[PDB]
Each structure stands twice: as C-alpha cells, then as structure tokens.
Amino acid sequence: PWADIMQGPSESFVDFANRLIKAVEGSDLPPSARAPVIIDCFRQKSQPDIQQLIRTAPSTLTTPGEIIKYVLDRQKTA
C-alpha cells in the first residue's frame, strides 16, 4: 500500500524513493494521478529533515525527478 510508506529513521532517500515509486506505479491509480501523489508523498513522508529541506526550496519543484535531484544535492551527508 503506497499510503502506508514512510522513510525509516536509518533509511537513505534513494531507497525510500525507489520503494515509493514502485508502490505507486504498481497500484490501482490512474496514470494521470501518479506524479502528484508521488510528489505529495515525498513532501509529507520522508522524515522531517527532508520535509523541511523540500519545504524551503527557493525554486518550485513540479516533478518527482526534480525533487529527487534537489534532495540528493542538498542532503545532509551522514
């Protein structure tokens, strides 16, 4: 179930994005509703450090690929 996917405290972001995109594209949603759902799940899941990282984006991110690129650039190396 896509709506139950959370980014674990120790999980990296690319694994979380892979799992989420897999569960959203392999589901019962229409094809035209996958990108907005993936974006809004990146924003509300993806534990509050990345949540604030996406929130304070000086540019407007309108695609899952752009969000992934931005987060991978500005992520907290740890």
Distance (Å, rounded) from C-alpha 26 to C-alpha 3?
13
**Which residues of this chain interact with its own copies, rule CB under 8 A?**
1, 3, 14, 17-19, 21-22, 25, 27-30, 32-33, 36-38, 40-41, 43-45, 48-49, 51-53, 55-60, 63-66, 68-70, 72-78
- CA-to-CA separations, 52 to 28, 56, 74, in angstroms, rounded: 30, 6, 11
Minimum separation from the CB atom of position 26 to its own copies (A): 9
| Closer residue to its own copies (CB): 10 or 52 | 52
SS3 content of the chain, % helix, strand, coil (to 5): 65, 0, 35
Q: Minimum CB separation from its own copies for residue 46, in Å?
A: 11
Minimum CB–partner distance for residue 8 and its own copies (Å): 16
Return d(Cα 38, Cα 34) in angstroms, integer: 6
